[PDB]
Structures are given as structure tokens and as C-alpha cells.
């Protein structure tokens, strides 16, 4: 409602670097807010795409940003009569970024990995890897829970059980308030998908450069399954956390599986031990139900509510015809120990192929009325197809069915304006939470400052 669409702020990266593919706010030890931006096709040293991360100080004018430097060199270790190998070419560093406390977690989901033992090998597969940084001190660390040293022949003998070679860990990322990093790995267990959790402090303390294969004892990975409903489900495409069981000491996980049960799509709510509490099934096949999940209390009862995006949902129209427009589902958490019922509200896009619901950002309380609000993105929507971000305000009965404000893309055609969103942080310190929007197609980020309600 009260986002200023006139005086925007634009940050920009190098051409073709996909600057803005992912973003987040970052507060330093002094509470100063900055913006961390991933650019998963930033050129490395060998003039080859490796990705990169930028840490942008807040300026009303915007501009260029300094790089948050990471080691982009391929690594090799000859240990235990074996040869360990990491390959950082086309790894997509910055395909997801997330900040917690004074720590930045940037992930390269397509970093490849292989192990050689004489004439056998583990196969060069994308296990993924995340890089951690404390910008004020200069500390660095890595976390790659799917790296293994099992040779290819063994996987075939054991029939590919517990095969973590294609995890692509870091595809999606989130950090609990207690500091436990939760990584989505949609390719784990032969494209079933897995989740990896470990404390941030233990990642830093148990990491040494050049080891390549090391243990994090406090880590916890999800479990393989023989149920075909999970086959090629990409369980872990999107991840989020919240409180859904009434006990405030436990933290619950929300996992998107957009091709679960033969492309039906599903979202599951689990405890910290990966035991399933609820499962929201998709409505329409190939809609990619679970492409994006968001957690925030919208109706102001203190109980977190769940939002699910299905950006390929095809709406029914006249003459038995279907129009791919996208849809968002709202689930309000009931009072006490009860199951999440049918959706409380259906928000459906308008522009054909607009992919409404591709990104959902909790905004906090934008208009300061007492109810939290959200932003939904249609990266190819709007009358021109340049992209749209729609703001929906919270109310006592859930959300308003019509938007309160619509942000049209200030970038040319094909910028994917809205593909990545982040809100609920006051960056200019005026008392109102603000919204950053990524447009990786144009290699830019736009900052919308919230203003007093007109």
C-alpha cells in the first residue's frame, strides 16, 4: 500500500552475471543494514563462470557494490590412497544467499565433486556446496554434507540407496533464529531430495582449509525412502521455518516438493527430526505446487501461517479452456493441536504465463495496522509482460483477496523482475519495513522504501 514507486534505488552488477538471482538483508554487529546479493554467473579467475556474492552498503542512490570474496580455485587432495576433487566451474555461487546475525551463507548448488581410486571413480556429480563468511572479521568456512568417498561400483551393488552424489545442497537455504542452517538438496537420494541441518558455529569450528572431506558431528540429514511417491519429487526445492506444533522450544521445518507424487506437488511440515507433521498436497499436476513457501502470521493471532506458490497453475476459463497464470495458497494455523485444513484463500494470477506465485516474501506490517502483509511476484506478468509484484495486506480473517499496491517493473523485457524477493527489514531506519526486488535478467536490484500511509 505505502511502498514508494517513484523514487527507487538501483544496485547493479556486471553484465551477464545474473546479479540479483537471490538476495537478503544483512545486519552487521552494529545493526547497520546492508544487502547481500548473489550473482551465480559472475566470471572467476580463468574467465569462466563461477558465480559471486556482493555486499551492498545502503545508499539512497545505489550503484556498484564490493565483492564478498571466496576461494574460487579448484581443489585436489591425495589422501587415503584416493584423490579428492572439487570443480567450481559453473557452480553457480550465489544461486541462494541467506544472512543470520553477522554471518552470510552463500551457496553454489552446482559445484561438482569426484573421487578417484586407481581406475575407479565416484563419478563427477553436482553435490553442491555453501560458503560462509563473517565480513567484519574476515573468517571463512564451507559446508558440503553430501560429499562422499564411495566409488561408483558400490552404489550399483547396493542399488543406489543413500546416494547423495547429486544433492545440489544449497539449492534453497534458511537459518533458524537459534543459528541452525538448513539446506535444501533437491537431488539427494537419487532425486528424491534431502535436507541438511547443522549449527553455524559448529560449521565454523569444524572446518579447516584443504580437508575437502570432514565430519560435522552435530549435523542431521533427512532419510532416504522407498516410496515411489517421492521419486523425482525434488523434496527440498524450497525451504522455510516456523512454529507449527505449539511448543516454542522446537523449531519446525517447511519443505517444498514441487514434483511429488508424479508431478502433483506437495509441501510438508516437519519437526527438527524430519518426522512429518502435515502434508499439503497439490491441486493440479505440473503446477509446481511448492515452488516457493513462506511463513508469517497474517491474521495477527500469534500463530504462524503458511503460504505456498504454484506459478504454473492453469486456471479454468470459458469454453473448457485453461490459462497458465499461477496461484498462491494461504493456510491459517488453527488454535491448538489440529491439522491444517483446506486453504483459507486462493490468489490467482491474471496475465498468461505470468508465473504469479513464483516468489513470496513476508513483508512484516507494511501499513502498521497490526497485521503482517506479504508480497507476491509474477516475474513475467503485467500488461506488458515485464513483471509485477503485488502486495496483499493482512486482516483478521486472513488476507485481502485483492492487492493494495502493484509494483510494475522498471527494467526492460526479460529481466525476471520479482524472481527473488525479501522484505520485513527497515533499511533506511524510518520506522517502516522495506522491500528489495531482484531482476537477474537485467543484473540489477531495486529497493522500495516504505513511507507513511497517505
Amino acid at each position, epitope marked *: 500500500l505505502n511502498l514508494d514507486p517513484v523514487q527507487l534505488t538501483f544496485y547493479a552488477g556486471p553484465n551477464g552475471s545474473q546479479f540479483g538471482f537471490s538476495l537478503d538483508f544483512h545486519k552487521d554487529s552494529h545493526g547497520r543494514v546492508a544487502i547481500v546479493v548473489g550473482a551465480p554467473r559472475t566470471l572467476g579467475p580463468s574467465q569462466e563462470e563461477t558465480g559471486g556474492v556482493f555486499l551492498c552498503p545502503w545508499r539512497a542512490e545505489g550503484g556498484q557494490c564490493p565483492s564478498l570474496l571466496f576461494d574460487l580455485r579448484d581443489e585436489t587432495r*591425495n*589422501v587415503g590412497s584416493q584423490t579428492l576433487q572439487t570443480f567450481k566451474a559453473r557452480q553457480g555461487l550465489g544461486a541462494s544467499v541467506v544472512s543470520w546475525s553477522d554471518v552470510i551463507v552463500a551457496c553454489a548448488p552446482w559445484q561438482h565433486w569426484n573421487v578417484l581410486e586407481k581406475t575407479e571413480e565416484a563419478e563427477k556429480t553436482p553435490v553442491g556446496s555453501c560458503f560462509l563468511a563473517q565480513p567484519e572479521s574476515g573468517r571463512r568456512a564451507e559446508y558440503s554434507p553430501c560429499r562422499g568417498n564411495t566409488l561408483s561400483r558400490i552404489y550399483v551393488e547396493n542399488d543406489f540407496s543413500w546416494d547423495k552424489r547429486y544433492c545440489e545442497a544449497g539449492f534453497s537455504s534458511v537459518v533458524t533464529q537459534a543459528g541452525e542452517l538448513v539446506l535444501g538438496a533437491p537431488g539427494g537420494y537419487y532425486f528424491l531430495g534431502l535436507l541438511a541441518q547443522a549449527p553455524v558455529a559448529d560449521i565454523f569450528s569444524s572446518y579447516r582449509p584443504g*580437508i575437502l*572431506l570432514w565430519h560435522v558431528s552435530s549435523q542431521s540429514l533427512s532419510f532416504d525412502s522407498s516410496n515411489p511417491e517421492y521419486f523425482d519429487g525434488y523434496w527440498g526445492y524450497s525451504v522455510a521455518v516456523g512454529e507449527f506444533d505449539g511448543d516454542l522450544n522446537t523449531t519446525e521445518y517447511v519443505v517444498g516438493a514441487p514434483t511429488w507424487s508424479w508431478t502433483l506437488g506437495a509441501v510438508e511440515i516437519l519437526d527438527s527430526y524430519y518426522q512429518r507433521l502435515h502434508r499439503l498436497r497439490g491441486e493440479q499436476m505440473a503446477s509446481y505446487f511448492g515452488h516457493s513457501v513462506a511463513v508469517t502470521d497474517v491474521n495477527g493471532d500469534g500463530r504462524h501461517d503458511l503460504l505456498v506458490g504454484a506459478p504454473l497453475y492453469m486456471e479454468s476459463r470459458a469454453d473448457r479452456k485453461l490459462a497458465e497464470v499461477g496461484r498462491v495458497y494461504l493456510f491459517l494455523q488453527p488454535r491448538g493441536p489440529h491439522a491444517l485444513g483446506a486453504p483459507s484463500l486462493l490468489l490467482t494470477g491474471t496475465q498468461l504465463y505470468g508465473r504469479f506465485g513464483s516468489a513470496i516474501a513476508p513483508l512484516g506490517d507494511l501499513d502498521r495496522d497490526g497485521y503482517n502483509d506479504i508480497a507476491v511476484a509474477a516475474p513475467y506478468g503485467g500488461p506488458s509482460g515485464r513483471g509485477q509484484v503485488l502486495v496483499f495486506l493482512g486482516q483478521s480473517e486472513g488476507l485481502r483477496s485483492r492487492p493494495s499496491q502493484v509494483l510494475d517493473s522498471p527494467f526492460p523485457t526479460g529481466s525476471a523482475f520479482g524472481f527473488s524477493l525479501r522484505g520485513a527489514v527497515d533499511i533506511d531506519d524510518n520506522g517502516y519495513p522495506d522491500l528489495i526486488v531482484g531482476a537477474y535478467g537485467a543484473n540489477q536490484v531495486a529497493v522500495y522504501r516504505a513511507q507513511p500511509v497517505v
Partner: antibody
Amino acid sequence: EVQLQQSGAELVKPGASVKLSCTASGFNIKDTYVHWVKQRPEQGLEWIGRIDPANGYTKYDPKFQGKATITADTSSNTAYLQLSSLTSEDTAVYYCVRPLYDYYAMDYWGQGTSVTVSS
Amino acid sequence: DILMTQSPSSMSVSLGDTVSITCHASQGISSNIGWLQQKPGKSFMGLIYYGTNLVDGVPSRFSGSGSGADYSLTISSLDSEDFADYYCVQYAQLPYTFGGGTKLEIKR
């Protein structure tokens, strides 16, 4: 805390067999590799072999091929080292080892089991 | 197999001295070396892994260094607990092999 508690000292006759144990304390035995090392005052330390308790796959030094058999039961959180056709030269102290962070290291050690072969 | 030549066999030193044990391999092992300690009539304690990295709980007066096939364990300002046996171990190749050992003894 990581602690490896082995079996008590054994006293056996030559030609017989013995099965040592190594129980994990404060963690899951399935987490890392588990090695076995033999110690004698003259010959010093010798590496017997390892096992991955998650799957049961073992490696051995060709010297001990035949006498040493390493197994693991994730149920009791315990690893085992079986010695067969015992000899006077098998009288030694035996340790089980596991790494800290590095997958291939040798950091945490049990207290040791004293074996004595004699008629 | 990789031969670990650990020298010296023993040394007579005193409290507060700065001593240095060395370990020489038959080929390059690229920092894939560990250091052990065995107090008299007791079990082993890990000191260094991957050439230079301290094991959790080990005081900072220990330090590992070296490259290729020559490595060094150094103890700055000896304590009364530091008089014991010390072994190097390589894990660059299977089978793992150990050094002969080095015994620190009180000088008088």
C-alpha cells in the same frame, strides 16, 4: 564427549581365538571410520585396518590378512576386532581409533586392551 | 609402503625449553600427517591432524609444520606434563604407517 571404551584385558592360549570390543560413548559409532592399531614395545605401532560401520566395508594391511577380522554392530554402538590362530607374536596392546574432523585422521583413541597369548 | 623415519629416538631436555621433533617420509605425503602423544602407562592423545591443525583441547604451545616429505612437531616452553612418547603417522596412502617414536626425558 567422545569416548571409546574397550573390553578388558584378555588372557588366551595359542591356536585359539579372541574377539575384542570397542564401545562408542557420547556419539554414534556409525558416524566415522573405525581403525584398529597394534602396539608392541619393539615393533612399535602397526595399523591393522578400518571399517565403516554404516555399511560394513573394511580395509586391511596385507600383513594381517587372515588373522584380523573387523566387524561392527550399530545396535550396541560397538565395533569388534577378532583375532584367529593366535601366536606368541600376537601378544600386544590393541587400540581402536577414530578421527575428529578429517575423514582419514587418527585422533580419538580408546584406553587399550592388553592381550597375552601363553600356554 | 611409506616408511616413517622419526628422529631423534630420545632427547634429554628441561622445563621451559623449545624442542622440535622431526619426521621424514619415503615420499611426498602433502601434509597428510598426524601427531600422537602417549603419557607413561596410558593411552594415546591426538595432537595434530593434516600437518598443522590442532586437535580440540590441545594447548597452543604445540605446533605442526612442514611440507612434502619433511614435517616438524614443536613444543614452545615445555610443561611437566609434556614428558611422554610422541609418534608421527601418515595417512596419505593405505596402509597407514607410524614412526618409530620419540621419548622426551628429564635432563639432569
